[PDB]
Design a protein around this ligand. Structure first.
Ligand SMILES: Nc1ncnc2c1ncn2[C@@H]1O[C@H](COP(=O)(O)OP(=O)(O)OP(=O)(O)O)[C@@H](O)[C@H]1O
Ligand SMILES: Nc1ncnc2c1ncn2[C@@H]1O[C@H](COP(=O)(O)OP(=O)(O)OP(=O)(O)O)[C@@H](O)[C@H]1O
Ligand SMILES: [Mg+2]
Ligand SMILES: [Mg+2]
Length: 580
């Protein structure tokens, strides 16, 4: 942080107080700051319905709010709480956009099935009543010292009730409510039962027109939520640390400001509404009070009673120093060799804990959620660190295209992407981060699917060795649930090629679309057929007998289940049956 210390020191025109130095150690961390990634993120093609990042319009009446986050470090120190708390964090993020949380995805990258990570995800989600609908279970010793835990949350919001994530005008106030504040993160055992009440309370305040802007409390606590709300609106704030409901009544002002206590929300509102907010909160049995005032002048003044605690420009907190970037010029696509990840069955794994509410049960790729009898969305998470380990550019890019395939195979049309950038050290290796970010930019360009939201985790490393570069893609699609194909007794075909050439990818797509439209069932898996598919087929009472083609690590083939032979402008070979 030294280069950034002298910058802050230059900007404040003195050494900083103690309070400042803590404010800044949180807001300019790489986690809150994105110093190495914000230029590359500006380069991504984006979407955000009518302004709102992370919200993608589905059908002119509803939108899906969706985002993926990582909780890697927390999960390595304490698997169960780490993972349970990252669910509670991501759920809260989607809540703040006004969306009722409908689905969880956990993408996991472990040297073994770490039970505590599995159950922390399961227990928390079960207790807030938000089901887990899919995710990834990627096993290899390569992640032995750095488990990756990326949780994706989604939910539905009406377009006429989207909550803005910023202040708009002086005179507004900021309410904080939810659990009380204690000395957390200066792992807390999040509670699901508090969070459920937070959900209901927030949605009820939304329904009455009370929320004009909102932002969940995460990293940085009151500090981030409140600086960010006004900073986005180009406004300032006076924040009154004494109004924050305490769980430890004898905390110092800096600890109130920076605490990372769970289940807390910020709500921007009119002062006339705040007392209704406060009343829904307490009804739920939440804590809450009016904590800050939105002021015109871009300062961020923090009071405790009438004692000044800190005052700095709002924009100086909000904008961490941006690192240079490296331009990356992709080369030729390599001959990949197999990096082995262990066969697992995510079916069996999750069954010490808690069939889902999707159109077709989990286990076959992409999950479809029903909004209306004839309206839905799909969701899937994918990554290819096996390929990315040998070629970061190409292996990343292929995860994105294989995401489109999974989305198409279920009948759905891709709408957007949320992505989680999991990486080693970008000071030491700046080019591999660039290959990763440029692979995500180009694959969005090539496929036409824009990025709605994302997250980054850098400095994932063990004794100077980095993890495999691991970008997990969560893609969202639009599909009518009445047109979703169910497994039935049928013939099985390999459709497509055993290897990969970029310029045929679009012809694979066009072929998956034709077949899905005639009502075929399709699997787009990277080793074509998994244990999870074979076991989920048994649930329907169906046995699959096939001779799987030999395929390259990167390929362009899918399996098509059909009573007739596919008729497409791509290679088609019949390889077995499923039945009985
Ligand atoms: N951690 C998990 N939690 C919940 N569901 C999971 C999890 N991991 C995998 N699943 C589900 O199990 C099914 C099998 O997933 P898996 O990744 O093994 O196969 P795939 O995604 O079809 O193929 P591939 O990843 O090899 O391209 C998918 O529907 C997946 O979403
Ligand atoms: N890899 C990425 N790809 C695209 N957009 C990203 C990526 N990483 C961050 N962003 C965007 O950068 C902005 C910074 O948000 P940030 O990730 O700091 O936290 P948040 O989503 O606001 O809240 P939380 O702390 O719960 O994640 C967000 O709008 C986010 O969606
Ligand atoms: Mg947020
Ligand atoms: Mg998968």
């Amino acid at each position: 942080k030294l280069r950034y210390l002298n910058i802050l020191k230059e900007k404040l025109g003195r050494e900083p107080t103690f309070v400042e130095l803590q404010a800044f150690s949180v807001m300019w961390s790489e986690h809150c700051g994105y110093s190495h990634t914000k230029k590359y993120i500006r380069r991504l093609p984006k979407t955000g319905f009518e302004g709102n990042a992370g919200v993608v319009n589905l059908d002119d009446y509803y939108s899906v709010a969706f985002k993926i986050e990582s909780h890697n470090h927390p999960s390595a120190i304490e698997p169960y709480n780490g993972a349970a708390t990252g669910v509670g964090g991501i759920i809260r993020d989607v809540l703040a956009m006004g969306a009722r949380p409908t689905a969880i995805f956990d993408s996991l990258h472990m040297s073994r099935i770490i039970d505590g990570i599995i159950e922390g995800i399961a227990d928390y989600g079960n207790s807030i009543g938000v089901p887990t609908v899919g995710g990834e279970l990627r096993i290899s010793s390569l992640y032995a010292h750095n488990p990756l835990v990326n949780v994706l949350a989604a939910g539905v919001v009406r377009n006429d009730m989207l909550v803005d994530s910023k202040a708009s005008r002086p005179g507004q106030v900021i309410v904080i409510f939810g659990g009380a504040t204690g000395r957390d993160g200066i792992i807390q055992v999040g509670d699901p039962f508090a969070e459920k009440m937070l959900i209901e309370a927030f949605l009820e305040m939304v329904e009455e027109g009370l929320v004009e802007g909102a932002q969940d409390l995460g990293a940085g606590g009151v500090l981030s939520a409140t600086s960010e709300l006004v900073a986005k609106g180009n406004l300032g704030a006076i924040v009154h640390l004494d109004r924050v409901p305490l769980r430890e009544p004898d905390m110092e002002p800096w600890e109130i400001l920076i605490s990372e206590s769970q289940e807390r929300m910020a709500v921007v509102t009119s002062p006339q509404k705040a007392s209704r907010i406060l009343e829904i909160a307490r009804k739920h049995l939440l804590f809450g009070d009016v904590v800050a005032e939105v002021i015109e002048e871009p300062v961020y003044r923090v009071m405790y009673r009438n004692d000044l605690v800190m005052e700095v420009p709002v924009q100086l907190l909000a904008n961490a120093p941006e690192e240079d970037i490296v331009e990356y010029t992709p080369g030729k696509i390599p001959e990949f060799k197999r990096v082995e990840f262990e066969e697992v069955n995510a079916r069996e794994v999750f069954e010490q804990y808690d069939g889902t509410d999707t159109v077709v049960p989990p286990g076959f790729g992409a999950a479809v959620m029903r909004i209306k009898r004839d309206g839905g969305y799909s969701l899937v998470t994918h990554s290819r660190a096996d390929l990315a380990l040998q070629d970061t550019y190409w292996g990343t890019l292929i995860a994105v295209l294989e995401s489109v395939r999974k989305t198409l195979s279920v009948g759905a049309e891709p709408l957007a992407i949320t992505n989680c950038v999991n990486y080693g050290d970008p000071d030491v290796d700046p080019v591999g981060l660039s290959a990763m970010m440029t692979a995500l930019k180009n694959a969005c360009e090539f496929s036409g699917v824009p990025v709605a939201s994302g997250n980054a985790s850098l400095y994932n490393t063990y004794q100077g060795k980095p993890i495999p570069p691991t970008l997990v893609v969560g893609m969202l699609g639009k599909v009518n649930p009445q047109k979703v194909a169910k497994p039935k007794p049928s013939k099985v075909f390999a459709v497509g090629w055993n290897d990969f050439e970029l310029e045929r990818e679009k012809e694979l797509w066009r072929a998956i679309r034709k077949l899905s439209e005639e009502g075929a069932f399709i699997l787009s898996s990277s080793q074509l057929l998994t244990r999870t598919h074979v076991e989920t087929f048994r649930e329907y009472g169906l046995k699959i007998e096939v001779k799987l083609p030999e395929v390259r690590p990167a390929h362009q083939m899918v399996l098509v289940f059909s009573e007739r032979t596919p008729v497409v402008d791509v290679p088609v070979k019949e390889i077995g049956t499923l039945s009985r």
